[PDB]
Scaffold this motif. Sequence first.
Motif, short mmCIF file in Angstrom:
data_model
loop_
_atom_site.label_atom_id
_atom_site.label_comp_id
_atom_site.label_asym_id
_atom_site.label_seq_id
_atom_site.Cartn_x
_atom_site.Cartn_y
_atom_site.Cartn_z
N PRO A 37 0.84 -1.19 0.00
CA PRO A 37 0.00 0.00 0.00
C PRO A 37 0.87 1.24 0.00
N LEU A 56 -4.63 6.96 0.02
CA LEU A 56 -3.96 5.68 0.07
C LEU A 56 -4.37 4.79 -1.09
N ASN A 58 -4.35 1.06 -2.08
CA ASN A 58 -4.25 -0.23 -1.41
C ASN A 58 -4.89 -1.32 -2.24
N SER A 60 -5.37 -4.58 -1.66
CA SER A 60 -6.19 -5.54 -0.94
C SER A 60 -7.56 -4.97 -0.57
N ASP A 61 -7.62 -3.67 -0.27
CA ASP A 61 -8.89 -3.02 0.05
C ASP A 61 -9.61 -2.53 -1.20
C1 LIG Z 1 -4.79 -2.32 2.91
O1 LIG Z 1 -6.10 -2.93 2.88
C2 LIG Z 1 -6.21 -4.12 3.68
C3 LIG Z 1 -7.59 -4.69 3.43
O2 LIG Z 1 -8.58 -3.84 3.99
C4 LIG Z 1 -5.96 -3.76 5.13
O3 LIG Z 1 -6.10 -4.92 5.94
C5 LIG Z 1 -4.56 -3.19 5.26
O4 LIG Z 1 -4.29 -2.84 6.61
C6 LIG Z 1 -4.41 -1.97 4.37
N1 LIG Z 1 -3.05 -1.45 4.44
C7 LIG Z 1 -2.74 -0.37 5.16
C8 LIG Z 1 -1.30 0.04 5.13
O5 LIG Z 1 -3.58 0.26 5.80
#
Ligand SMILES: *[C@@H]1O[C@H](CO)[C@@H](O)[C@H](O)[C@H]1NC(C)=O
Lengths: 412, 412, 192, 192
Positions: A37, A56, A58, A60-61
């Motif tokens: 991220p 941000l 990211n 995965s999100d």
């Molecule tokens: C990126 O998204 C994932 C999934 O929601 C989350 O678990 C993760 O903490 C996020 N990364 C940051 C650096 O916040």
Amino acid sequence: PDPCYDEHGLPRRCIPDFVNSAFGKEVKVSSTCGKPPSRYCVVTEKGEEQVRSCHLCNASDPKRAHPPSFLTDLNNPHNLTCWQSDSYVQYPHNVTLTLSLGKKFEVTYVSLQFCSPRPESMAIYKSMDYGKTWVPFQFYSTQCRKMYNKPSRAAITKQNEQEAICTDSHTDVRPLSGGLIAFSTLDGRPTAHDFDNSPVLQDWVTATDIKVTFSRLHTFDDSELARDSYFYAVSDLQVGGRCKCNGHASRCVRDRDDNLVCDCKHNTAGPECDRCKPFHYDRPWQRATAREANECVACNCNLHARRCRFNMELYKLSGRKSGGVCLNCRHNTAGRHCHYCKEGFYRDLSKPISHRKACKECDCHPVGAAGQTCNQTTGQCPCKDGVTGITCNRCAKGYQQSRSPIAPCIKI
Amino acid sequence: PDPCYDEHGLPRRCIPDFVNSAFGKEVKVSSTCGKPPSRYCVVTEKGEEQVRSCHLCNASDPKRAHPPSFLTDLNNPHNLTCWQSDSYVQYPHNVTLTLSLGKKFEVTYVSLQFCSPRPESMAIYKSMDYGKTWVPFQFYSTQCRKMYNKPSRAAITKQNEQEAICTDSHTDVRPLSGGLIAFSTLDGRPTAHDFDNSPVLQDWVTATDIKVTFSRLHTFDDSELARDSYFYAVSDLQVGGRCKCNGHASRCVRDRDDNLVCDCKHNTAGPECDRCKPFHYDRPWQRATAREANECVACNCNLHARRCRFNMELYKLSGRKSGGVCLNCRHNTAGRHCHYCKEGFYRDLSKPISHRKACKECDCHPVGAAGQTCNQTTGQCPCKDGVTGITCNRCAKGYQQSRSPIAPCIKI
Amino acid sequence: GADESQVPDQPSSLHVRPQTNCIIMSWTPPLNPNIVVRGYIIGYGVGSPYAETVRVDSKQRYYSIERLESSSHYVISLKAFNNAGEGVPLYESATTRSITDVSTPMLPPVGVQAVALTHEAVRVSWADNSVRLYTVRWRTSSAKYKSEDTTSLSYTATGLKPNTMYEFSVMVTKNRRSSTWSMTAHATTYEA
Amino acid sequence: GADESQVPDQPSSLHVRPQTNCIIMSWTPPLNPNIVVRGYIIGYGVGSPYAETVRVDSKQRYYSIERLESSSHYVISLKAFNNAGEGVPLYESATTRSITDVSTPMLPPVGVQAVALTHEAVRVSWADNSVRLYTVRWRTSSAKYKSEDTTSLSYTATGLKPNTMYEFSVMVTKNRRSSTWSMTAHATTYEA
Ligand SMILES: *[C@@H]1O[C@H](CO)[C@@H](O)[C@H](O)[C@H]1NC(C)=O
Ligand SMILES: *[C@@H]1O[C@H](CO)[C@@H](O)[C@H](O)[C@H]1NC(C)=O
Ligand SMILES: *[C@@H]1O[C@H](CO)[C@@H](O)[C@H](O)[C@H]1NC(C)=O
Ligand SMILES: *[C@@H]1O[C@H](CO)[C@@H](O)[C@H](O)[C@H]1NC(C)=O
Ligand SMILES: *[C@@H]1O[C@H](CO)[C@@H](O)[C@H](O)[C@H]1NC(C)=O
Ligand SMILES: *[C@@H]1O[C@H](CO)[C@@H](O)[C@H](O)[C@H]1NC(C)=O
Ligand SMILES: [Ca+2]
Ligand SMILES: [Ca+2]
């Protein structure tokens, strides 16, 4: 009903629907943010000053992710999705988008639409053979001679209609979001009104693949905020045009191999309808014209040949109409069309020339006959001097047989 | 019914059944394992490597014994029997198989079939006279010039059809078991299509005996395992062909002496039907031909001769048909056929020339007759000057007797 | 068949009729029915019967050995078999015919004449240049034929409706091989 | 329409009929009625459909794209939309006609002749120097006309009251564009 044939039964030229070929497809990208991220910064102008906003990326999100899927998904202004390259992808960095159409399309235009400011330097290439070799389609830069080595805005003549032009168009950092790039492959080509009759332009438009490379961004400093603000974002990618069926299909579909091919109805064949389908080789294949649809014609074998081949000499000889010749005629018939019975045979006449047994055995007498060949219809054989009958088995009135097989009948 | 005569009564050529002459018979062998129980090693190939297996050869135990009986017994693949030479029978060792047929056979082929790998060097000889003298039939080697002193693969001309050829055929160590050697005595002889008309080839094929000598084995080391693996094994031995009856018998059987002879029905004789049977000597003996069966013909003696002899001069003189002459005709008859009554006798005529008493005493008068001989039929005698009658015992009318025995009758 | 304890004894007969490129063979089972016969192993080849081996049904009395060479002396062997194994073979040998025989396909007879003898009879004669079963046929000149075979070069047809023109043809057969119908001769029988 | 949860699926058809300076377009709603359709976004332009964008009523089946260039290849896109947003577009492309077509306005046919065939019939013929729908009309020479269309250069009028002089005129139509009434020819039908 088939759009490939008219009000009653006649072949007429047909063209597939104009589509955005990119819409389904997956597009490979050199980079995308979010991998670990990361941070990006989008700059805004309210009145006269620059206001930075940070966010941000990211992967995965789902709210913060910007995959290449988002290049070709449904393009909803109200809800908008952008693929996003990572930060400090500035020169001499490339970011490359590459897309296979898996089929030869005639492309009318190529559209990119940016969530970010437009790039200052970009190049559009096509592959004309399924990814192996590329040629340039268009070039966009502020410095064309510098970046792409192309003198900008070269006038296009008849003797180069295929030349890739570099131009400064659509390079403005404004709009800072939602900005467009639309390449029109027919724009300013000389013979572009004649596209139906110009092979070079029809060729120019054909592509199996489209590759976009972003070369330079816009400046708008070396700090890390500055770096995190430098990236590419595209909301939608479109390759508009038609499937290349040579005027011989209105559709393209998948085949047994899950390849995309033209659904060819002219008695045509192959993925582009570039050839006649088998046993249609009477005349040589043509592309469809507005004035004359040209469909492969079946050559006439009268059921006695399962194969066919075209003969140019015959074509040219027969008045430039037909045509082809049948290959090996079964059922004792002899070409071109297997339209008669082979030498050594004769006609049944109780069947027409088409029927299986329309070729009747012509049986001549080993002794009485001077040769093995019937008269085609009458049934006669070449009887020797003093012999007579259909086959020649008997001496004529006034004659009688001898001990000589060579001279079987003599007078008295 | 006799195959030697046709649909009705006529002599036709006949040939005995084609048989494997070796099938019953006992064959003498130079060596056989098991004598003191010994060890042998048979090598196998599974994939690429050599795997040794060891076994006991024991002549007293029936499972482990390998006698020469097992050369000619019934050949059952499912249950198989091999004679087996002992170990380290390698060069310059011979192993010899020798077989008497006790009869002259025309041999078409000779077969050996090996439980062991084929030998690299072997020789086939025949005896043509009941074991006394041998001639070579065939030679098999990798080195023919070396082993048998025979240049290998000599082309066979008309002027040597009897030449023993050495060749490399069927010498491969593969198969390592169950491998064959089949000699064909007619193979590549020039006149072999003419065998019926070629005496040299008919001669070439004739044998009373067959001797096989194994000369060299295959190498595949000097250790004792190596030595125990070197030997000969034959599962079946066959001499194929027919009994030589000269076309004059369909069978061969035992005679009073338990010798095997042709059962000769052409009026032929001797063990091969090489001669006519007695009192058939009218024409000279021939071998049977497809076109002309030639049977000895009985000569005609009219019951008066019990013996007969052929005369070449007579044959040649009489138009090349007949023939022979009868020997000493009893019952006062005189040859050739005893077809008349001896000088000094006359005909009965109340019997035909065949009958015992068809020769009637011709009695002439010691005085009245000028000689002792009748007229053959009429009964007359050679009366002197003035005498008369059948015998001459009385003076004719006008005549009377005198005191002179020389001149018995005088006129008056 | 009572029992399979031992192998079959030998076949009772074997007979072979050579063709030019082929050979026909026939045989019969062993005389002793009591030993189960599960089929036969034929084997064959030039000069020895090892070149090839065929396996057949127990109920097979016949076989055709079908790809072979002209003018070649083949030896044939026949075995009967069962679970015990195979029994002792019977052999015979045959020499295939020459391709000369099929080279020139047989040609009809020539110089054919039919002369009417009587009201019921017609004499037919022909010639041949080959130096033999001839088949004569006759019909009215619709109505169909009548056949006869002869060993000679002339035949005499009997039983003919008087004053009727007939049609006579001849073919020939050599070493079981036949020509086609020779040219026809037309003769009219006598008025009775 | 049941629910607005998602955007409309694509329009079912799209068809475009190019004029010289204009283009006419027609279409139909998506096949699925259950998703509320609040209107359409048409978009258009030369070589790509981005030059301009029009928004319309849900009940609109038709649109005329009205200021455009001769001999130009336009690409047209059509989307249906609602509160969710806009759905996937349908496209088509069209090449406007040339100002050549409106330059010389169409002129009538010349060399027109009407010859009376019968009491009920008159043959009309004309010519053209252009190297096509011709419309013939006739009337009594007050009383008014009768019309007929032909694909050819000659027509035959039927159903005419005998011994009456009529008046015949022709016009022509090219690529949906029409001339005026050609000069009149006067012919009197035959007495029956
Ligand atoms: C990126 O998204 C994932 C999934 O929601 C989350 O678990 C993760 O903490 C996020 N990364 C940051 C650096 O916040
Ligand atoms: C609408 O937009 C979001 C975030 O930009 C994106 O994740 C998603 O594709 C869309 N949501 C739906 C309803 O698919
Ligand atoms: C990357 O950038 C270079 C600039 O030197 C350019 O020539 C090239 O075409 C770009 N694309 C790729 C795939 O390297
Ligand atoms: C050989 O076989 C006989 C008979 O079975 C047996 O008695 C003898 O022991 C065997 N010889 C050896 C060395 O085993
Ligand atoms: C079968 O084979 C064995 C061992 O190889 C041999 O002793 C014998 O001849 C055969 N047995 C019979 C049933 O004869
Ligand atoms: C034995 O071997 C010799 C090799 O010198 C060979 O010539 C001979 O014929 C063989 N046979 C006999 C019975 O000696
Ligand atoms: Ca998107
Ligand atoms: Ca054995």
